[PDB]
Ligand binder design. Structure first.
Ligand SMILES: [Mg+2]
Ligand SMILES: [Mg+2]
Ligand SMILES: [Mg+2]
Ligand SMILES: [Mg+2]
Ligand SMILES: [Mg+2]
Lengths: 247, 247, 247, 247, 247, 247
């Protein structure tokens, strides 16, 4: 029930399918909320590992202190690791997919780590002396400008080219007019079901406005305004008037 | 025992009733002392979760060191995470409401963390390998200009659109003239009760004065100014003279 | 055993007596050494809570790292916060009075933290999940111009209105003529006993200049200047000559 | 083995004797090496507490991170301050004398901290809930112009008046002609014993020069310069020639 | 295996022999690579403490954060972690010699720290309440102009007089021309043994050139240049041509 | 597995072979990322140290905070560095070779630290009291202008003379055109094997492009262009068109 219509978005769909069997890093770019996450989840579904686990992880929320430990895991004992060994996120994602959103926020200390992972697929647990090898597909995404961040010295160049093999840039919504209404209608149908309203579709007078709004919030802001509209809707159709005060 | 008179305030009151059944984020804005906390606390009472827990957080008072840990909780080891697993504020608010006060005073480093929580309601405990999903309706407030702070890059654009589902603009008190006199009477009644004075109500001269002060502290300073008057009061009524030295 | 003579200070004394039963925050302002601490300490004595504990705190010296911890208290989930639970200063002062001196010396970062404490009297221990409520009367002092600092954006406006219930302006000593000579006799009498000198009082020739010195240190330097004089005194009386080299 | 000959220095010596029984702050000023340390040590010896502990501290050498802790001491808690409680420097000096050298080298942020300590002799240990009271005579020294630094707003005015009870301005060596030679003989005599040379005294030609050098280092450089000469000395007397390469 | 020919160096060699019995600070100056480290090391060998420890430190390479800790040492606690009491470099050098190399690049903030340490040799451990007294001979070296920096206010005057007991200014190699050829021959013989080549000596044409190079790197560049030639050498002698591309 | 065709590289290859037995520093210059690692890794192979470890590290990309820690290593002491007893890159490379890339892009603060390391190979562990000596061959490289930066004071002169023994230039890739096709085929072979494609070799039309083109990325972009091209390749040969969109 996901929407891909515009040529640019349709092109991505084909591109994704071609790499479904690929075991190599992917870097997703675009403004935040252009559906980069859906793309990441889609790659998992269309691959041969689709039946395997899909691990979603926020890398920012991870404390710098335990970062290495929580990712790669740790063995029993070994620096206050209690009496028990515990797996890391990579091992949990073994054979599956690991998705890093907002990867662009990471300490240079931490960025340098994981470097040796991507290509070699090998690492050591904290305090473990036995090398472990795992099979993991790495996916990364950011709403930032990756190209510039390297130049500003906030991101290591050497890491970019490993991750920057394949790059899919979801363009902003304002340049996708064809994808506006189809998305807008789908959400209406969705929110109408959860909140249980009588609403169906949009007036043409309203339809023109949605087109002429250059969506700085992309498809998220879009999803949100409708949720407001559906709640404040009265009749079976939503006019420009109800949205006029909203935009 | 809450005061809503002015037209602008009545419009907001209705909106709250409409969202009684709403499970989605709300962003409250306004100057200092316009009752932002009350609104947040009020929405909970008029919702279906009213008997369930209401969690108040200043979100500033949270130490950056344990910030990640205290919110998402942690498992039985952190690197000395003691012997016990311990819940976070989010799990505490499960089925209930979580209120983030003065969120705009929060560091960009920290904002990015909360990101996948708001929309997905999914996160990881520290050292935990099991994804946890919880249901919490999130309330946020600031006395700053959130709209502009994003433009100035002091606040994440990506976070705003997640919280910015519903946006309530509480106007200043100076634009609510009708809410002036009624409030002042309420506080007087209250403080007369606490301090046990003989005071009942206001002179016409004082009432007139209260109108011409543009309440830079809004309804906070107001409560304070009245409390001041009650202590220094002698008779049963408050004249312009007792307030003359106050303004 | 204190000195109140001048009309302005005698005028101040009455206000204190009226609010003895008041449970609300007080902010004392003025030049350095004008007796801000005695006033604050006095208010406790003249109140109905006078028999309860009085907590004196210089809020400058608190390190930012434990700032959160030392105030609100903490549980054993403090990252090797040992095995023991510890109360905070607010909880210790429950039912009593808490005096925050030099509040104006706080970083805007630090100020926002205190915010929900002052007004709500509610907070969370670090790692605690149950809200704690305390009854604390707030006393405040600063050497700054508090009114101006707000306009300069160096002090949070939202915090001022929480603390700014009652405002007391202690004037400089140069504007208090009546309180000059009486104080001097008090200190001389005091130090004469401590140091065991033969000195009794001041000559009229000495006394006239002492009034015409605009005491930039207010009453500290005087107390100090007299402390200096007794030690260098010879006879039973102090002439203009002994004080001439001091000014 | 301390040298006081010059009239200027003898007056100071008298000042010291009169305050022997006095308990209160003393502020020493002057160029570097004018014997500020000697005086401070001297005041202690000639006092009634001379038998009590003397704590010498460079408040510059204290790292900004633990500064708060090292002074006031701490109990088990906070900091992740491990498992051991420790007294602070003030408690160590209780009843005795504390000497702060180069106090003028202290950060303005840090200065404000000391305030309620110096005057009241009252504080809280870090993590301690018991107010501790100590009796401490405060000694201070600086290589700057303390009076001027205040006018430039680089030093707290409020702290100065706390510390500024007694004021000692040690003059430069160039203004002490009488203290030159006597000091020089002392240094020569001492080093002659330590290094075991045959030197006794100065030529008349050499003596003339020592006065005509405007001793920018006061008596430090002097002690060093003599130390230089003794080492390169051959005969029983030191001529201008051996000093020519030094001065 | 050291070379001293030039008058300037021979004078210096003698000065050192005279201080063999000296326990006092030494400040070494000169351009980079003039043998400041060996000279400092030499003074130790020729002193009575030559068998006692010689502690070498790059005081730049010390992190600004722990600078205080590693020098003065620390006891249990009084830092994050640090479960063990630990000595420091000053304490390590007791009875011996401490060499601070490249001392002149140290921050003004940092210089003041060492101040009560250098001359008095007394300090407190981090977290220690017991004064430590040590006997350490201090050696200092820099590629800067120390005397001039003082007038420029980039270096503490108060510190200068402490280190500036004995001052040795190593002249450049260009004015030591007599020391050029002997050194070059010395290096040639050395590298010839290590690399095992057939080379013996220099042509006169080459020798003339070596003199006409104003060696801005003094003896480092020279040492390097000889090492370069030997590796690319063919015959038993090195002509001016092989060096032409080097200069 | 290295490719040498162009005249400049063939003569350069000889330089390395003659110095095979040399134990001394080498400074490599060139545009960014051009076989600098390849040259350096090769020199090790041809050395007597070929059997010992080779540690490659980017010394610029490491944050200043742990900069000190990662180089010399650290003990269980200062920091905050937990229990980790960890070798530093210098200690890790003992007996082997250490390669520092883009050292010229490093901040002056950091340069001064490493100073005593390079030449002496001597240092202290952080918190360690035992002098450590290592035997390491130093290899250095930069994408900067080296010598000229010194004149601009952007690079320390004292440091340059340590590293500047041997100097290599290397051509840009555009002047090595003979080495284009051989290299391109080798990398092509790699990705075909790893990714399992049907590709064999290049079309003549593709070769036409390979000749005339501003490769500013030298041999980096080539690896990227092929890695991109191979993945999007369809047929058995690569045409001019698919490479066109990559540039
Ligand atoms: Mg995202
Ligand atoms: Mg609030
Ligand atoms: Mg005060
Ligand atoms: Mg001193
Ligand atoms: Mg050196």
């Amino acid at each position: 029930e996901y929407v891909f219509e515009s040529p640019k978005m349709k092109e991505i769909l084909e591109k994704i399918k071609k790499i479904s069997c690929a075991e190599c890093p992917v870097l997703i770019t675009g403004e935040s909320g252009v559906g980069k996450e859906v793309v990441a989840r889609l790659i998992h579904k269309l691959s041969d590992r689709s039946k395997e686990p899909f691990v979603a992880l926020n890398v920012a929320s991870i404390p710098r202190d335990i970062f290495e430990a929580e990712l790669f895991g740790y063995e029993k004992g070994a620096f206050t690791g209690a009496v028990s060994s515990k797996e890391g996120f990579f091992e949990l994602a073994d054979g599956g997919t690991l998705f890093l959103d907002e990867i662009g926020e990471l300490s240079l200390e931490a960025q340098a780590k994981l470097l040796r992972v991507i290509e070699s697929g090998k690492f050591y647990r904290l305090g473990g002396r036995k090398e472990i090898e795992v099979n993991v597909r790495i996916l990364a995404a950011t709403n930032r400008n990756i190209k510039e961040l390297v130049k500003e010295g906030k991101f290591r160049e050497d890491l970019y080219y490993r991750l920057g093999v394949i790059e899919i840039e979801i363009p902003p919504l304002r340049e996708r007019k064809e994808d506006i209404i189809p998305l807008a209608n789908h959400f209406l149908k969705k929110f109408s079901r959860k909140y249980a309203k009588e609403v169906e579709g949009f007036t043409k007078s309203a339809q023109e406005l949605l087109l002429s709004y250059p969506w700085y919030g992309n498809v998220r802001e879009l999803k949100n305004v409708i949720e407001r509209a559906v709640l404040f809707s009265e009749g079976k159709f939503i006019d420009r008037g109800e949205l006029s005060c909203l935009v």
